[PDB]
Amino acid sequence: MLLYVLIISNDKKLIEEARKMAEKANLELRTVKTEDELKKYLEEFRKESQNIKVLILVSNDEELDKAKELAQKMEIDVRTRKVTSPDEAKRWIKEFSEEGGSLEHHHHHH
């Protein structure tokens, strides 16, 4: 199973602490810069949509809604969460990683 993380924030350190968790878990994290970027990664995720799960961390409620709107229309499974503090995002990446995509989480690191 493929596991991707999309981060939307203006704080460069929040991006680092988010990456730190992803790197420890060996998850594929992408930095979202615009509505086009968010869309762009989703259009790419349409490739391996067979076995993919995406986690999205947004700074604002607008970013939250816009992300899920693009995903719904293109039938992509994304987990939209809102965070202003790095520790919050660190939790979401933690829980999203520990499950290993599915209950039968087998040894996998990308």
Which structural domains are found in the chain, ordered by start? 1-110 (3.40.50.11230)
Q: What are phi and psi of 19, to 5 degrees?
A: -60, -45
With residue 82 as reference, give the H or E element that holds it: strand 78-82
Q: At what angle do helices 35-45 and 61-73 cross, to 10 degrees?
A: 30
Encoded amino acid at 87, one letter: D
Q: CB of 18 within 8 A of CB of 29?
A: yes
**In the sheet that 78-82 helps form, which strands lie side by side, from edge to edge?**
28-31, 2-8, 52-58, 78-82
What is the rounded CA–CA span in Å between residue 95 and residue 66?
A: 23
What is the rounded CA–CA span in Å between residue 50 and residue 61?
A: 29
Q: From the CB of residue 66, how many other CB atoms can be counted at a distance below 10 Å?
A: 17
Beta pairing, strands 52-58 & 2-8: parallel
DSSP-based three-state secondary structure for 102: coil
Angle at 86 between CA 15 and CA 100, to 5 degrees: 80
Residue ranges of alpha helices (H) inside 1-110 are 12-25, 35-45, 61-73, 86-98
What is the rounded CA–CA span in Å between residue 62 and residue 53?
A: 22
